[PDB]
Amino acid sequence: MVNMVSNPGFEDGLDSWQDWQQDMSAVPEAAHNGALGLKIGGGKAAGGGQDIPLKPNTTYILGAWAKFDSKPAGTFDVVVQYHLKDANNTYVQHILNFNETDWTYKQLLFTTPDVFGSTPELALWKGDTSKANLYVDDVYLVEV
Ligand SMILES: OC[C@H]1O[C@@H](O[C@H]2[C@H](O)[C@H](O)[C@H](O[C@H]3[C@H](O)[C@H](O)[C@H](O[C@H]4[C@H](O)[C@H](O)[C@H](O[C@H]5[C@H](O)[C@H](O)[C@@H](O)O[C@@H]5CO)O[C@@H]4CO)O[C@@H]3CO)O[C@@H]2CO)[C@@H](O)[C@@H](O)[C@@H]1O
Ligand SMILES: [Ca+2]
């Protein structure tokens, strides 16, 4: 069994993760497992992610642990996103939504198309604009 996500538990800090809004830190307060987790700071929409080459016609599971440290207004989303390879490059997003203030695990299943329009991206997107900080850890993307 292989997790496609690089540094999936943030145990190597922010290695392999893009920081899009300069609002990410690998800290112990955000750890669900191991010593570190990802904190996305509250107050503005922010996130990060990584490119993950996926196999065509393949079924995957996407899962993650998350919690906000205070009640949020919006959500924190764990997303696999890519274009289909057709005349339109239709955009598809497989989305997990979190708004819980206790550590919560969520997972989904998806099957990739025969051809990709773009390289799949794993996005950790804290669209919430409340003061709440977001903790995320142990992100899984696994072929089943
Ligand atoms: O900033 C410099 C770097 O930017 C990089 O590009 C980033 C960009 O900055 C931004 O962070 C962007 O963030 C997007 C997320 O990646 C993701 O695609 C997200 O998708 C959202 C939808 O927008 C929408 O909100 C959707 O709502 C759903 C709910 O989730 C739910 O299902 C239900 O309520 O229905 C709703 C729809 O009605 O949720 C999606 C999942 O979160 O949108 C974000 C934009 O707001 O990501 C870019 C990377 O992809 C790079 O360009 C980099 O090079 C720069 O350095
Ligand atoms: Ca961890």
CATH number at residue 86: 2.60.120.260
Contact 27, 36 (CB under 8 A): yes
* Residue range(s) defining the domain that contains residue 127: 1-144
Contact 117, 88 (CB under 8 A): no
Phi-psi region of 104 (alpha: psi -120 to 50; beta: other; left: phi over 0): beta
Strand partners of residue 116: 84
CA 93 to ligand 1 centroid distance, Å = 10
Phi-psi region of 138 (alpha: psi -120 to 50; beta: other; left: phi over 0): left
* Least distant ligand from the CA of 20: 1
CA-wise closest residue to 47 among 81, 71, 70: 81
Residue 63 tokens read as 């899962």
* Residue 127: C-alpha distances to residues 18, 32, 107, 113, 131 (Å): 16, 21, 19, 27, 12
Contact 52, 141 (CB under 8 A): yes
CA-wise closest residue to 117 among 86, 81, 79: 86
C-alpha to C-alpha distance for 80 and 10, rounded to whole angstroms: 18
Spell out the residues 6+ positions from residue 50 whose beta carbon is closer than 8 angstroms to its own: 5, 6, 16, 17, 18, 121, 122
Number of domains in the chain: 1
Q: Nominal resolution in Å?
A: 1.5
Using CB atoms within 10 Å of the CB of residue 35, give its burial: 0 to 12 exposed, 13 to 18 middle, 19+ buried. Answer: exposed
C-alpha to C-alpha distance for 20 and 17, rounded to whole angstroms: 9
Contact 45, 127 (CB under 8 A): yes
9 is in an annotated binding site: yes
Contact 61, 142 (CB under 8 A): yes
CA-77 nearest atom, ligand 1:
42
Spell out the residues 6+ positions from residue 78 whose beta carbon is closer than 8 angstroms to its own: 62, 63, 64, 66, 95, 96, 98, 106, 122, 123, 124, 125, 136, 139
Residue 6 tokens read as 């690089």
Contact 32, 102 (CB under 8 A): no
CA-121 nearest atom, ligand 1:
50
